[PDB]
């Protein structure tokens, strides 16, 4: 079996991508944020505190004939940005682009932080990292990808994110028309529960490629590219007027400047991120200072290849017994 779903940016800056997901019987369609940096499928629901809901579509388990309360199970998660959510657990049928899993753990939110409430376009998250990160207790639950694995033609999913445009998430097959050249595969370490890999280096604009190992995670749920201070300083040094601002919380640059591209290595292959993808627009409405898409990972403790990097490539997440990541130009 296979699945194929269109993912759409929530705004003009590609801050996040939402994909329609069918939950329950009859289907209730929610727009979820596919997150390869987490392992919980959680949604806004009829149980979420009324004041913490602002425009989201809610999942209503009482209207679903296949919904079953997972007696005693609770969940609590905290994200890298400081946001959080918690609640109880239901099992129900979940479908993504025609691919169906019965008995998927659907985590119903009772409480959500202000960050989620303010994003009216996101109805929840669908975690695609390894099941070891799932927060359901006392019985840890499996991700949608893990549950679908046996039924898939190939144990893979692909991320093909668009730049200011819709993209595609495919499950169980590799679309050979979605990329150019070959796919370069690289080793994944599952030790921390993430799709963790090692980039072979970088180049700024038309500069010389610097071979240096950069350990990081392929994270669809993070908007920006977070890299070591040394790399990030070398990139922003090529932009006239760029500086790190403590008031803003990162590198900013004059909106009038042109941004060089950024190249990252995948084995012997190179993925080029165009300069335009690194522009996140004015820090405030009418401001002439713009926010950079390449930021330091020093305060985070882990390097993150977020949407800025992933949208420049066709990405294969191979969930075989020996997991790998594939990158191709597109």
Swiss-Prot record:
Q: Which domain of life is it from?
A: Eukaryota
Give the EC number(s) under which this enzyme is classified: 3.4.23.22
Q: Which reaction does it catalyse?
A: Hydrolysis of proteins with specificity similar to that of pepsin A, prefers hydrophobic residues at P1 and P1', but does not cleave 14-Ala-|-Leu-15 in the B chain of insulin or Z-Glu-Tyr. Clots milk
The SS bond pairs are 255-290
Question: Which GO biological process categories is it annotated with?
Answer: proteolysis
Record has Signal as a keyword: yes
- Keyword field: Aspartyl protease, Disulfide bond, Hydrolase, Protease, Signal, Zymogen
Q: What does the sequence similarity comment in the record state about its family?
A: Belongs to the peptidase A1 family.
Give the protein's recorded name. Answer: Endothiapepsin
Per the UniProt entry, what species is this protein from, by scientific name?
Cryphonectria parasitica
What are the top taxonomic ranks of the organism? Eukaryota, Fungi, Dikarya, Ascomycota, Pezizomycotina
Gene of this entry: EAPA
Whole protein: which stretch is covered?
Answer: 90 to 419 of 419
